[PDB]
Design a protein around this ligand. Structure first.
Ligand SMILES: N=C(N)N[C@@H]1Cc2ccccc2[C@H]1NC(=O)C(=O)Nc1ccc(Cl)c(F)c1
Ligand SMILES: *[C@@H]1O[C@H](CO)[C@@H](O)[C@H](O)[C@H]1NC(C)=O
Ligand SMILES: *[C@@H]1O[C@H](CO)[C@@H](O)[C@H](O)[C@H]1NC(C)=O
Ligand SMILES: *[C@@H]1O[C@H](CO)[C@@H](O)[C@H](O)[C@H]1NC(C)=O
Ligand SMILES: *[C@@H]1O[C@H](CO)[C@@H](O)[C@H](O)[C@H]1NC(C)=O
Ligand SMILES: *[C@@H]1O[C@H](CO)[C@@H](O)[C@H](O)[C@H]1NC(C)=O
Ligand SMILES: *[C@@H]1O[C@H](CO)[C@@H](O)[C@H](O)[C@H]1NC(C)=O
Ligand SMILES: *[C@@H]1O[C@H](CO)[C@@H](O)[C@H](O)[C@H]1NC(C)=O
Ligand SMILES: *[C@@H]1O[C@H](CO)[C@@H](O)[C@H](O)[C@H]1NC(C)=O
Ligand SMILES: *[C@@H]1O[C@H](CO)[C@@H](O)[C@H](O)[C@H]1NC(C)=O
Ligand SMILES: *[C@@H]1O[C@H](CO)[C@@H](O)[C@H](O)[C@H]1NC(C)=O
Ligand SMILES: *[C@@H]1O[C@H](CO)[C@@H](O)[C@H](O)[C@H]1NC(C)=O
Length: 339
């Protein structure tokens, strides 16, 4: 017998104590080693309700990642409420590692194993676990990187699809590689990303067909974002400590929906902090080749309003709430207290 409850979670990881990489350092001091033989119990005849959009596990992960970045990735100047903070901004070793979230005694984590679970409502195939799977704390907008893939069909997630103000999370069932590079040898902030156009356009066509099922077979249209902060209008992410901002106009070009697509990118020092603490200037990029190859496993979308009297629905890449990134991985888990 159990009931829905929130409690203090702890973390587990396979971090190395001898690593200078910042995720390793944080996890060494903030997490315990992983269980080599974890137990999972599949529950029979058990129906449980989940709600990925109201899940305290997400708030707790957010607190961890904020703490990690605060101790690791420090900007040269910080612009809060008018209180300017100047500090050292050393270049670091940066590469996210999987973090597991675990319940203490008296509690357990229920896991939804339904193949086409959208994140809310009843789940039929439920199991109980001690810890989540390993989740990499990848901070990004527009595209979700290095995550897990949907097991069967592409999944559309939203707290309320009818509400255009609510962010849509697209969970891909097939990853697409994105290859981003700041070449060695001169604009030190000029970079680019390479993507297989045949792979991407095929996947995007499938996303269109899935969106049709949720929007009464209306015509599905992709468009680049219309105004807003750079973090939202561009695909922003962190590669080896450096903030990349990439133009994704070529990715959301309803025309193609086959060669190599090259997105123009820029390394930015002055950014709007995802933590929500204002503007900050980080250190200039390191020398040499800066490269990150990532799997696109999800897309963050925002639907246009004002289209109720037409046969079209328009979607633009979005983001800005990093909690949605954690939701995209934590959707199938909830904490319950054992009586
Ligand atoms: N939606 C907006 N225009 N701003 C939102 C609004 C809001 C509310 C609460 C906390 C934050 C934020 C803003 N979000 C950000 O500044 C942001 O996500 N920045 C950012 C910077 C770097 C990278 Cl690599 C990245 F992935 C994201
Ligand atoms: C529930 O579990 C059974 C047995 O593994 C599986 O055949 C079925 O597809 C599952 N149902 C859903 C909704 O995934
Ligand atoms: C990239 O995608 C491939 C294919 O799914 C996967 O095997 C690999 O682990 C992914 N790399 C990651 C998660 O960084
Ligand atoms: C991904 O899901 C779609 C349905 O949304 C399905 O048609 C397609 O076969 C799936 N792709 C893979 C690789 O399983
Ligand atoms: C998810 O499933 C629930 C229960 O069937 C349903 O009410 C809701 O509309 C679904 N959400 C999405 C995004 O399809
Ligand atoms: C979903 O959004 C629509 C449009 O804003 C709203 O009318 C409706 O009440 C919402 N549904 C729920 C269950 O909140
Ligand atoms: C990434 O792109 C560069 C050229 O831009 C190439 O040398 C490298 O092999 C690519 N990496 C992968 C994994 O394809
Ligand atoms: C791009 O992806 C397709 C599959 O969609 C693959 O057959 C092709 O080899 C890829 N192109 C390159 C240059 O690797
Ligand atoms: C979309 O089209 C299919 C047939 O191609 C139909 O079965 C389905 O009901 C349609 N969905 C709608 C109209 O919402
Ligand atoms: C992205 O590139 C396109 C094509 O050059 C340009 O029209 C658009 O303004 C760019 N978007 C942003 C947000 O810079
Ligand atoms: C859309 O793709 C086509 C490919 O022929 C290109 O000509 C056009 O300029 C693209 N539009 C963009 C990138 O906004
Ligand atoms: C995604 O994972 C790969 C493999 O670990 C890594 O090399 C790459 O830097 C990651 N991308 C991001 C944005 O963290």
């Amino acid at each position: 017998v159990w009931k829905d409850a929130d409690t203090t979670l702890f973390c587990a990881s396979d971090a190395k104590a001898h690593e200078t990489e910042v995720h390793n350092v944080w996890a060494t001091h903030a997490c315990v080693p992983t269980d080599p033989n974890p137990q999972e119990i599949h529950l029979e005849n058990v129906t449980e309700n989940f709600n990925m959009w109201k899940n305290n596990m997400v708030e707790q992960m957010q607190e961890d990642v904020i703490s990690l970045w605060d101790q690791s990735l420090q900007p040269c100047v910080k612009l809060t409420g008018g209180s300017v903070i100047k500090q050292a901004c050393p270049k670091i070793s940066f590469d996210p590692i999987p973090i597991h979230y675990c319940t203490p005694a008296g509690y357990v984590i229920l896991k939804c194993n339904d193949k086409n679970f959208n994140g809310t409502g009843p789940c039929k195939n439920v199991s109980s676990v001690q810890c989540t799977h390993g989740i990499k704390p990848v901070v990004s907008t527009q595209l979700l990187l290095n995550g897990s893939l949907a097991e069967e069909e592409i999944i559309i997630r939203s707290e309320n699809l009818t509400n255009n103000a609510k962010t849509i999370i697209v969970h891909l069932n097939k990853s697409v590689e994105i290859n981003c590079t700041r070449p060695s040898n001169g604009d030190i902030r000029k970079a680019y990303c390479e993507i297989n156009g045949t792979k991407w356009n095929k996947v995007l066509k499938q996303v269109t067909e899935k969106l049709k099922e949720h929007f009464n077979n209306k015509t599905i249209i992709f468009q680049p974002p219309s105004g807003g902060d750079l973090e939202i209008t561009m695909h922003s992410f962190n590669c080896r400590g450096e903030f990349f901002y990439c133009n994704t106009t070529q990715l959301f070009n309803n025309t193609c929906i086959n060669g190599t697509i090259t997105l123009p990118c820029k390394i930015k020092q002055i950014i709007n902090m995802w933590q929500g603490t204002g503007q900050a200037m980080y250190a200039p990029p390191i020398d040499g080749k800066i490269n990150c190859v990532s799997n696109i496993t999800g897309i963050l979308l925002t639907r246009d309003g004002g289209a109720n009297n037409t046969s079209n629905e328009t979607f633009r890449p979005g983001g800005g709430n990093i909690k949605d990134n954690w939701r995209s991985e934590l959707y199938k888990y909830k904490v319950v207290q054992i009586e």
